[PDB]
């Protein structure tokens, strides 16, 4: 069937220009300097991808000898719902298990090789949807972000539509402001962390 040039397995990237604002959701948070947003307008386009991925992976007779290289994109079956997602191979955890990052969501896990499928270039036409972000204007007031600061950040953005504003482009991410416009005096995630002690200015 499909003979794939791995040169043709280039994932696409959302163009986020400085000054772009979009309505999105904070999908996954490591710290205020390491988190992921998705564009709210992605819900349908992504449910569509997921349907295509499910259809495609079901036609693969999932028998063995698939060993992706570090950095390949492939399909990974998420442990919590058993659905198929796009995933970057980050590292092998053993001979038979791999650390993978879900490139449309921002989370990660270690999976059996039995839960990975190769991908084809048709399924890379959607740009990767998890936008890697660093929160503008703040540094951790101890030099390390404490799980309490992170908790608070999670609380400010959970189940909420957030305005993400691109302040700058970094090498592998976007520097952003996060602004909840659902409170009539608008609230910056940066400002609340500064006001609460956890952050200091830069």
């Amino acid at each position: 069937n499909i003979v794939v040039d791995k040169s043709d397995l280039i994932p696409k990237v959302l163009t986020l220009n400085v000054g772009d604002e979009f309505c999105g959701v904070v999908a996954h948070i490591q710290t205020p300097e390491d988190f992921f947003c998705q564009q709210l307008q992605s819900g349908r386009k992504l449910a569509e991808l997921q349907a295509s991925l499910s259809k495609y992976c079901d036609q693969l007779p999932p028998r063995s000898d698939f060993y992706p290289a570090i950095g390949d994109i492939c399909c990974a079956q998420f442990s919590e719902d058993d659905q198929w997602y796009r995933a970057s191979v980050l590292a092998y955890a053993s001979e038979e298990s791999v650390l993978v990052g879900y490139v449309d969501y921002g989370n990660f896990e270690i999976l059996s090789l039995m839960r990975l499928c190769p991908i084809i270039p048709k399924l890379l036409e959607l740009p990767m949807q998890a936008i890697k972000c660093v929160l503008a204007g703040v540094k951790p007031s101890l030099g390390i972000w404490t799980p309490e600061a992170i908790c608070l950040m999670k609380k400010l953005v959970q189940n909420k539509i957030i305005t993400v504003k691109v302040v700058d482009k970094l090498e592998n991410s976007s520097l952003v402001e996060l602004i909840d416009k659902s409170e009539t005096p608008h609230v910056s995630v940066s400002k609340v962390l500064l006001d609460a002690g956890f952050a200091v200015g830069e």
Partner: peptide
């Protein structure tokens, strides 16, 4: 959220 997502699907299943």
């Amino acid at each position: 959220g997502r699907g299943r």
